[PDB]
Design an enzyme around this catalytic site. Structure first.
Site, PDB file in Angstrom:
ATOM      1  NE  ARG B 150      -3.955  -2.108   1.127  1.00 48.54           N
ATOM      2  CZ  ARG B 150      -4.429  -3.205   0.296  1.00 48.54           C
ATOM      3  NH1 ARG B 150      -3.652  -3.802  -0.626  1.00 48.54           N
ATOM      4  NH2 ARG B 150      -5.779  -3.612   0.325  1.00 48.54           N
ATOM      5  CG  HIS B 326      -6.001 -17.033 -17.235  1.00 49.46           C
ATOM      6  ND1 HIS B 326      -6.076 -17.265 -16.029  1.00 49.46           N
ATOM      7  CD2 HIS B 326      -6.755 -15.845 -17.453  1.00 49.46           C
ATOM      8  CE1 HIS B 326      -7.151 -16.621 -15.571  1.00 49.46           C
ATOM      9  NE2 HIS B 326      -7.536 -15.800 -16.321  1.00 49.46           N
ATOM     10  CG  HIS B 355     -15.908 -21.788 -15.974  1.00 48.41           C
ATOM     11  ND1 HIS B 355     -16.919 -20.963 -15.137  1.00 48.41           N
ATOM     12  CD2 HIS B 355     -15.164 -20.558 -16.306  1.00 48.41           C
ATOM     13  CE1 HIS B 355     -16.807 -19.641 -15.343  1.00 48.41           C
ATOM     14  NE2 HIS B 355     -15.525 -19.573 -15.958  1.00 48.41           N
ATOM     15  CD  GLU B 356     -12.619 -21.078 -19.123  1.00 48.44           C
ATOM     16  OE1 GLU B 356     -12.611 -20.594 -19.963  1.00 48.44           O
ATOM     17  OE2 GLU B 356     -12.376 -20.741 -17.847  1.00 48.44           O
ATOM     18  CG  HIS B 359     -16.748 -18.969 -21.114  1.00 51.19           C
ATOM     19  ND1 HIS B 359     -17.376 -17.437 -21.247  1.00 51.19           N
ATOM     20  CD2 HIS B 359     -16.501 -19.302 -19.919  1.00 51.19           C
ATOM     21  CE1 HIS B 359     -17.267 -17.403 -19.793  1.00 51.19           C
ATOM     22  NE2 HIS B 359     -16.738 -18.351 -18.992  1.00 51.19           N
ATOM     23  CD  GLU B 383     -16.597 -15.643 -16.161  1.00 53.34           C
ATOM     24  OE1 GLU B 383     -16.936 -15.946 -15.082  1.00 53.34           O
ATOM     25  OE2 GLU B 383     -15.615 -15.804 -16.717  1.00 53.34           O
ATOM     26  CD1 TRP B 458      -9.862   2.951   1.240  1.00 47.78           C
ATOM     27  CD2 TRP B 458     -11.328   2.450  -0.408  1.00 47.78           C
ATOM     28  NE1 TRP B 458      -9.644   1.679   0.865  1.00 47.78           N
ATOM     29  CE2 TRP B 458     -10.636   1.458  -0.327  1.00 47.78           C
ATOM     30  CE3 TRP B 458     -12.596   2.487  -1.369  1.00 47.78           C
ATOM     31  CZ2 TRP B 458     -10.797   0.389  -1.087  1.00 47.78           C
ATOM     32  CZ3 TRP B 458     -12.573   1.490  -2.153  1.00 47.78           C
ATOM     33  CH2 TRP B 458     -11.827   0.215  -1.830  1.00 47.78           C
ATOM     34  CG  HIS B 486     -10.486  -5.344 -11.814  1.00 43.86           C
ATOM     35  ND1 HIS B 486      -9.960  -6.413 -11.111  1.00 43.86           N
ATOM     36  CD2 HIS B 486     -10.927  -6.074 -12.837  1.00 43.86           C
ATOM     37  CE1 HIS B 486     -10.305  -7.624 -11.260  1.00 43.86           C
ATOM     38  NE2 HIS B 486     -10.662  -7.441 -12.607  1.00 43.86           N
ATOM     39  CE1 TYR B 496     -14.991 -10.287 -12.733  1.00 43.46           C
ATOM     40  CE2 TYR B 496     -14.252  -7.992 -12.176  1.00 43.46           C
ATOM     41  CZ  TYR B 496     -14.055  -9.231 -12.857  1.00 43.46           C
ATOM     42  OH  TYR B 496     -12.965  -9.462 -13.713  1.00 43.46           O
TER      43      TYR B 496
END
Ligand SMILES: *[C@@H]1O[C@H](CO)[C@@H](O)[C@H](O)[C@H]1NC(C)=O
Ligand SMILES: *[C@@H]1O[C@H](CO)[C@@H](O)[C@H](O)[C@H]1NC(C)=O
EC number: 3.4.17.23
Lengths: 201, 593
Positions: B150, B326, B355-356, B359, B383, B458, B486, B496
């Site tokens: 941080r 990945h 899962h893949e 798609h 997703e 924050w 992100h 998400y």
């Protein structure tokens, strides 16, 4: 009169989507010699037995031959709906049929090995509303024959022809030939009307 | 009529884009499969042409105004082209924004934190700091790893992030948007529908209305987690206060999945794992995908294409080839579907295969649509479709049927609670965090939080909403949100949240069709063609109808609903309420840090 099997023994065998059809009528056939001319790998018959294919006289004997690797045999199996059936060749099961795989030994220099194996992956009519896929009729040819006639150079190459209300697109996938050339036959026997003169030698 | 001049333009653009995006996708695939020096250069060369062509066509598409086109499909295709983003500022502002974004990305990707005690312990975030923050139980080690990240990377990002907010707000306001938050929320907007419209201001209302119902279950889960974390860090956590931010299981506490070994409900019943059974039966990496394809076929969905088996890379190459590990599903273009995965013989990879492949099954469904309409209904659908398959694939009944479990296996009622609690640490343990983060960003883009209150607001929000307190005081020289991937890479984060709400909305809807009796978490949709037809009907639509209409095609409702998500975790909710009788549920914001 022995049936003329020279065309499949000369020149480059055609691709699956541009298969070569020869109709034999009123001749003596010896398919065992032709099978001996290759290394037979697979032999699957529907509504008929291989013993009943070598023997028995038929009104007409249609041989649709093309170049085909053994690894893609499972995609030619009846019932499986894939790219080969949809856009290259749909086997006609209204009559007894036989699917014969083989392998050309390297000593047979009369046949020229093509650079690659080619089969169509897409053949559709494109408007602005999306895609309309054209599917092969059982036993017929693909609507994209004239466009695909130019041939394909690389993997997934597309040819487009303008129409009055959109366009027509065809796509080809390319895989190179490694090893002894493999080629497939679809043999259909007709019992209908005209003389059982296609008889074994 | 100008609609017919739009039709011909779209007809040309569809073919040009189809032929130009495929080359870019192929270059990306070639680079990701064989990492070399020529492949990256070719990838950039191919990606520049696609960007130039897309910019030119987007500029040309504004010639046709939208207030006279009457065909919904043509208007939907034209809107995607006419939506212009960064190409509205001046050249100087554009290059300044690009440089700021690149600098932020490279600061995040090449940042090091060094041990305050050992000067030769400068670690990157990916290999070392992550390893410390996910595989440690030392309070001081975790504290220093948290604070170093941080303070060494999040401190030199704030000057860049302050100019980034102004530069993006200028771009957003140069496009008839209130702020950049409105621009981001515009992805859920639907117009010109009869009753299937959706305003940008409705997304905030729906998100808050769902979070209000989610809150009690999260409060019980947080109480249980706090009560079980006391035994691992004695005399360090207040019995009624928040949770310190450096003990949550990773750098940011996005998921609580890494806290499972410390709080296993029943430690004598081991969770179901079939890695040994897969090894005993000699399962290679191809049989896993064959079984996934069989499961997908059993519900009425198509087979995998001929080129999928020839072109996909299901195993790591052995001849010194450099690949990215990945797992991804690739829509290369002209009906070319591939999967890049380094498959190992394990349960996790067995679930990743399904899962893949979900798609890829989604991509097969809308392949007969225009080029611009070949996406999911929105960013949350693609997703959410790939998670119901993984939910169905891991059920004990499915594992018994495929042959990975003995036929006499009896389902215990104590392993169900273990499975449910491990599930409600990635799913329920991330819903507040995600939401909180987005809220902050929205306010920061709206001007509600001045540049002189970023850290204060924050940490106040993270104490009030998430229930997590900071370990050390942080004045307004750090940028704590920018320390997340992100935020520094300029990615929207609401996808998400809705993803987790659609996911259990579909699964319930498909489980009533399949005629399943019992709890929802034990539901299996295999060997049910009727449940597959309903899913395929929505899948085939693509981005051609408003996502409200597509959602109603399956679930029978137009709005996001959180009731199925609470129905999934009902036994776990009862168990958590039972176990929290002798404890305090809830936290105290400004109390012991
Ligand atoms: C999928 O392929 C299998 C061959 O493994 C075949 O038996 C089945 O009929 C095919 N199903 C569809 C829908 O194509
Ligand atoms: C990467 O590998 C592929 C096959 O594995 C090969 O064809 C290609 O040439 C390699 N890349 C380079 C730059 O040589």
């Amino acid at each position: 009169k022995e049936c003329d099997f020279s065309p499949m023994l000369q020149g480059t065998p055609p691709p699956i989507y541009d298969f070569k059809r020869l109709v034999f009528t009123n001749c003596n056939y010896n398919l065992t010699k032709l099978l001996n001319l290759f290394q037979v790998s697979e032999f699957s018959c529907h509504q008929v037995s291989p013993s009943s294919l070598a023997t028995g006289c038929y009104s007409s004997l249609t041989v649709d031959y093309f170049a085909y690797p053994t690894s893609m045999s499972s995609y030619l199996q009846p019932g499986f709906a894939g790219e080969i059936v949809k856009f290259n060749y749909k086997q006609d099961f209204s009559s007894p049929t036989c699917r014969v795989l083989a392998t050309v030994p390297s000593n047979l220099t009369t046949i020229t090995k093509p650079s690659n194996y080619v089969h169509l992956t897409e053949c559709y009519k494109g408007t602005a509303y999306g895609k309309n896929y054209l599917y092969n009729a059982p036993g017929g040819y693909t609507p994209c024959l004239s466009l695909a006639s130019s041939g394909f150079s690389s993997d997934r190459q597309s040819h487009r022809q303008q129409l009055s209300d959109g366009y027509l697109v065809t796509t080809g996938s390319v895989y190179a030939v490694n090893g002894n050339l493999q080629m497939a036959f679809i043999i259909s026997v007709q019992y209908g009307t005209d003389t059982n003169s296609v008889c074994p030698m | 009529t100008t609609e017919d001049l739009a039709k011909t333009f779209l007809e040309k653009f569809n073919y040009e884009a189809e032929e130009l995006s495929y080359q870019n996708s192929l270059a990306s695939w070639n680079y990701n499969t064989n990492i070399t020096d020529e492949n990256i250069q070719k990838m950039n060369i191919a990606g520049a042409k696609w960007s130039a062509f897309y910019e030119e066509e987007s500029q040309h598409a504004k010639t046709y105004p939208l207030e006279e086109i009457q065909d919904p499909i043509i208007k939907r295709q034209l809107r995607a082209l006419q939506q212009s983003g960064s190409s509205v500022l001046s050249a100087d502002k554009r290059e300044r924004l690009n440089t700021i974004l690149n600098a932020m990305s490279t600061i995040y990707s090449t940042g090091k934190a060094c041990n305050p005690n050992n000067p030769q312990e400068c670690l990157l975030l990916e290999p070392g700091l992550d390893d410390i923050m996910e595989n440690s139980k030392d309070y001081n080690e975790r504290l220093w790893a948290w604070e170093g990240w941080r303070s060494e990377v999040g401190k030199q990002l704030r000057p860049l992030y302050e100019e980034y907010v102004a530069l993006k707000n200028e771009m957003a306001r140069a496009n008839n948007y209130e702020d950049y938050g409105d621009y981001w929320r515009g992805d859920y907007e639907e117009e010109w529908a009869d009753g299937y419209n959706y305003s940008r201001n409705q997304l905030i209302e729906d998100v808050e209305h769902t979070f209000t119902q989610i809150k009690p279950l999260y409060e019980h889960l947080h109480a249980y987690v706090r009560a079980k974390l006391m035994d691992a860090y004695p005399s360090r956590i207040s019995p009624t206060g928040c949770l310190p931010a450096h003990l949550l299981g990773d750098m940011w506490g996005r998921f609580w999945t890494n806290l499972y070994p410390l709080m296993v409900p029943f430690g004598q019943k081991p969770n179901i794992d079939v890695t040994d059974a897969m090894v005993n039966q000699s399962w290679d990496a191809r049989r896993i995908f064959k079984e996934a394809e069989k499961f997908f076929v059993s519900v009425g969905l198509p087979n995998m294409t001929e080129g999928f088996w020839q072109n996909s890379m299901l195993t790591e190459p052995g001849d010194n080839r450099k690949v990215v590990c990945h797992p991804t599903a690739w829509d290369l273009g002209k009906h070319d579907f591939r999967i890049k995965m380094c498959t190992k013989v394990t349960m996790d990879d067995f679930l990743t295969a399904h899962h893949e492949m979900g798609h890829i099954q989604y991509d097969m469904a809308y392949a007969a649509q225009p080029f611009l309409l070949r996406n999911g209904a929105n960013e949350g659908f693609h997703e959410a479709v790939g998670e119901i398959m993984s939910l169905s694939a891991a059920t004990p009944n499915h594992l018994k049927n495929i042959g990975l479990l003995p036929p006499d296996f009896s389902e215990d009622s104590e392993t169900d609670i273990n499975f449910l609690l491990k599930q409600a640490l990635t799913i329920v343990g991330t819903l507040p965090f995600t939401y909180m983060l987005e809220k902050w960003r929205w306010m920061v883009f709206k001007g509600e939080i001045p540049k002189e209150q970023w850290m204060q607001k924050w940490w106040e929000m993270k104490r009030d909403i998430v229930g997590v307190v900071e370990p050390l005081p942080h004045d307004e020289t750090y940028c704590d949100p920018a320390a997340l991937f992100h935020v520094a890479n300029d990615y929207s984060f609401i996808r998400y949240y809705t993803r987790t709400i659609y996911q259990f909305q579909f699964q319930e809807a498909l489980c009533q069709i399949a005629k399943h009796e019992g709890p929802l978490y034990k539901c299996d949709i295999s060997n049910s063609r009727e449940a597959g037809q309903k899913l395929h009907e929505m899948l085939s639509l693509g981005r051609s109808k408003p996502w409200t209409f597509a959602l109603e095609r399956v679930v029978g409702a137009k709005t996001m609903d959180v009731r199925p998500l609470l129905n999934y975790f009902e036994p776990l909710f009862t168990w958590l309420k039972e176990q929290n009788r002798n404890s305090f549920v809830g936290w105290n914001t400004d109390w012991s840090p």
